[PDB]
Symmetry: C2
Subunit: 347 residues, 2 copies
């Protein structure tokens, strides 16, 4: 019973594909799907993907509408495909994964995740659905999330925030903190201690600690004096230097959020995807200071302090590996006479 | 149960829409409809119409596959729409009529031809289908075809040839000669005495009379002598004059067919539709003689002789009306000292 006209019927009456029977008339013209309502044509969907318009439309209609992990997490853990669902990437207006399992006949490589073809792929399993936990046992490579514990397996506690219909949030009407589990070539693996990025916007930026509130409210000199941060180059690294043509430092998102209230500036996101580290092309409207590639990360300031304070300030240059969002980020550390010059994410 | 995937299923298994249940996967990319067969994508339809790709695809799939009248006839009689079918125009690779009655939800203006919306339109009715003759009786404006007689109604005998899946032919396994009837504002109308064009090609041209066979086989002077055509300017009108830069005359298709065997030339069909009269841009490869607008018609030579023989050669200029394919064509006749100079279809 699967058809274009049926998919559209569901979208019109329910907002997403809900397995309802019915049809409505449809027009396809130039990567857009229209339908007729009271004699006039109405835009339902504009294809921004590399898939065919009608295939993309169907995958969108069947997108997951419960809280799910942010795509950067799933990428960091090496997830190749999802089991009997679709993770819509709202930053690319596209599917997170281009192949499917038991969802859409045009994109399916299999009907069930146990088929031989799936063995070499790392499959995503949602423990909230019935039968998925057992499929995760029996699977050769995979990733599993659950709300509660699963006896037999050691959990890793994930981040507090998740994505719900494109909105990243910390749920209180719904649970957004998951237990993570992973398997490689038939063997369960221990996940390392990790920090997590906070996934915040620049315009609707909110603090999440007393230190963050102090940072936003206080002046520069006062903040450094309290919390005793002399020699750690917060002037350069967090606050940022706008005195020369080349913009200096400015690698923590909170730093941008402070500057933005006082004096708006221009960001170009020339690689628009979800990442643990982001690169922006930044031009400061007040000064005319700019930089082509500016590496930015959103750590809780408290955690950034913890990371920098636990380093050796004796060496001139050093690469520092740190586990964030379940992956190794490299940082470059420069010191001079026992204080820091700079400390930034490597390219 | 109307759907894209179902329409395609029928096309794949039956060649046209035959009301079968089933689905196959489909892709839409750039005005083309594809389907997957043994893992690979296959072109089913390329849209050359002004309709949306999926709408056009459906109308094509539901095209009429019995012998039907050539579009030029239907146009000449003033048919605006067809009742519960689709007449595909194979010269335009498009529908003959852009609106429908009980065929496709996107293009339908009504479900039945008796609805009030249909009253001002001239509807086509096919007497071979059950109930159509009665619908023709109740209709305000319409055209009807039948194989046999219909009690009460005076018939007009149509042409011998009809179109079958794009092929124009005189049927012997099937009947292609119809009785025609027409109504205007509730009143049956008498259709006039008419000639019919022969609908022949230039490359596969075949004669249909002894006179036509003689024309092709014999030399010019001999043909004019035998059928006594002195003073009727067949040298100019039919055979054509290639001695000057501007090509002279050449208005009968048989004339082209004779020339083409001896010495091929170039036609440009700059308005590609079916018409009783055609205009071509012609360049003669042998001489370099040419003409921008060359009006051509395909009458049976016998009929052309009959028409020209029954004229008054006393006037210098005269417009001559002649009924061909149920419509009035004007001809321009020039005479000088009791013989003809030229005689051609008016522009």
């Amino acid at each position: 019973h699967m058809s274009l006209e049926n998919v559209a019927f569901n979208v019109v009456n329910k907002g997403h594909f809900d397995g309802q029977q019915g049809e409505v008339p449809v027009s396809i013209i130039n990567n857009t799907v229209y339908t007729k309502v009271d004699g006039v044509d109405v835009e339902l969907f504009e294809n921004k993907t590399t898939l065919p318009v009608n295939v993309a439309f169907e995958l969108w209609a069947k997108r997951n509408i419960k809280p799910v992990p942010e795509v950067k997490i799933l990428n960091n853990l090496g997830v190749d495909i999802a089991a009997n669902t679709v993770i819509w990437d709202y930053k690319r207006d596209a599917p997170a994964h281009i192949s499917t399992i038991g969802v859409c006949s045009m994109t399916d490589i299999a009907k069930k995740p146990t088929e031989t073809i799936c063995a070499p792929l790392t499959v995503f399993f949602d423990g909230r659905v019935d039968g998925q936990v057992d499929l995760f046992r029996n699977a050769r490579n995979g990733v599993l999330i659950t709300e509660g514990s699963v006896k037999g397996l050691q959990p890793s506690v994930g981040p507090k925030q998740a994505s719900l219909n494109g909105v990243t949030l910390i749920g209180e009407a719904v649970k957004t903190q998951f237990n993570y589990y992973k398997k490689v070539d038939g063997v369960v693996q221990q996940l390392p201690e990790t920090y997590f990025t906070q996934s915040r916007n620049l315009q609707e930026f909110k603090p999440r600690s007393q230190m963050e509130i102090d940072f936003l409210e206080l002046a520069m000199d006062e903040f450094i004096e309290r919390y005793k941060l002399e020699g750690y180059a917060f002037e350069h690294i967090v606050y940022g230097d706008f005195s020369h043509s080349q913009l200096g430092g400015l690698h923590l998102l909170i730093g941008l959020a402070k500057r933005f209230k006082e004096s708006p500036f221009e960001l170009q996101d020339f690689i628009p995807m979800d990442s643990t580290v982001k690169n922006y092309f930044i031009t400061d409207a007040q000064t005319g200071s700019s930089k082509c590639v500016c590496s930015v990360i959103d750590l809780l300031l408290d955690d950034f302090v913890e990371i920098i304070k636990s380093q050796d300030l004796s060496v001139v240059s050093k690469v520092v590996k740190v586990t964030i969002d379940y992956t190794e980020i490299s940082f470059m550390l420069w010191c001079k006479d026992g204080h820091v010059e700079t400390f930034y994410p490597k390219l």
